[PDB]
């Protein structure tokens, strides 16, 4: 979904998904809640 974001708005430098949602110390219990925020930041930046 990030590569489809980069191809529609001509911004190859755009980055919303960051390598920190999985924490192996705490077994990654908030991995889904972190990526759901990053998908919400991606679409809100798409609507604007």
């Amino acid at each position: 979904a990030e590569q489809a974001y980069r191809w529609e708005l001509n911004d190859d430098s755009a980055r919303f998904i960051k390598p920190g949602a999985w924490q192996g110390t705490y077994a990654g219990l908030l991995a889904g809640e972190t990526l759901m925020l990053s998908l919400a930041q991606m679409e809100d930046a798409h609507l604007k």
Partner: protein, 49 residues
């Protein structure tokens, strides 16, 4: 009574070494409440849209 002190310490060692201790839910609360505020500013934005 020296056994009950040894057993109370074996419980206190269990509450501090299990995965679901207080240090887990301090992390789960402190991280989600940073997500839950940043998600709110995006959720109230589309209520305005």
């Amino acid at each position: 009574l020296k056994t009950q002190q040894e057993q109370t310490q074996s419980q206190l060692a269990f509450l501090q070494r299990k995965f679901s201790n207080q240090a887990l839910y301090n992390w789960l609360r402190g991280r989600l409440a940073a997500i839950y505020f940043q998600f709110y500013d995006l959720a109230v934005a589309r209520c305005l849209m």
